[PDB]
Nucleic acid binder design. Structure first.
Length: 129
RNA sequence: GUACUAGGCCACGGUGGCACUGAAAAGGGGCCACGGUUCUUAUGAACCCAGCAGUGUUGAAUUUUGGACAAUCGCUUGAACGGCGGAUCCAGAUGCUGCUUACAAA
């Protein structure tokens, strides 16, 4: 009941009403700003620490061209098929950036010796790491 | 609705006219006239990069006077992995891109 909210219900964790019984007037309502989209792209790149445009753009078109069920459990599946997120799922680093340095050493051993594609992934199902 | 990719077909080879041969006609085949470029002791001859590189003007801007027949593919030759091809294949300079890139050591 409390948990498992809607996957796009992130407007309940930004500003709320009828749960704050004080300050009846002067309540901040959200304006028409696209800066939350730009900072959400910042939340996307900060989960990779990578240069802003090219990687998230290339993963965006790959996420469109892979399958067409939806864009929410599958676009983050395109995020999750990437190798630095995959290493963070294994737990070989404190965070994504340290894992990126570890793969920058080529300490990693994806599919035998090394990933053939270091910056882009993409780990298909059936690929050892 | 509008600049390219590669490739289909046509047209043209400084300009214009025409012919041989060939089954079919001419981009480094033949003849004449033009317009250029050089030289003559001036009488006349030689040549025509919209082939490759390269030069010069203009341009905001335009590449190396590279290697090679080995791969094709073509032409040719009955030896000979033969001969040739600025087609091509490989390298350069140069926009776009996809893709890596810390060294040490087995």
């Amino acid at each position: 009941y409390w948990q498992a909210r809607s996957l796009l219900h992130e407007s309940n964790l930004h500003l709320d009403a009828l749960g704050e019984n004080p300050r009846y007037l002067r309540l901040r309502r959200v304006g028409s700003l696209f800066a939350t989209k730009l900072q959400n792209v910042r939340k996307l790149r900060l989960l990779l620490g990578f240069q802003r445009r090219g990687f998230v753009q290339k993963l965006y078109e790959h996420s469109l061209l892979a399958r067409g069920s939806d864009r929410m459990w599958k676009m983050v599946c395109a995020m999750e098929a990437t190798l630095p997120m995959t290493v963070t799922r294994m737990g070989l680093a404190e965070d994504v950036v340290g894992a990126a340095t570890a793969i920058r050493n080529d300490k990693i051993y994806v599919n035998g010796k090394q990933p053939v594609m270091p910056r882009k992934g993409l780990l298909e199902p059936g690929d050892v790491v």
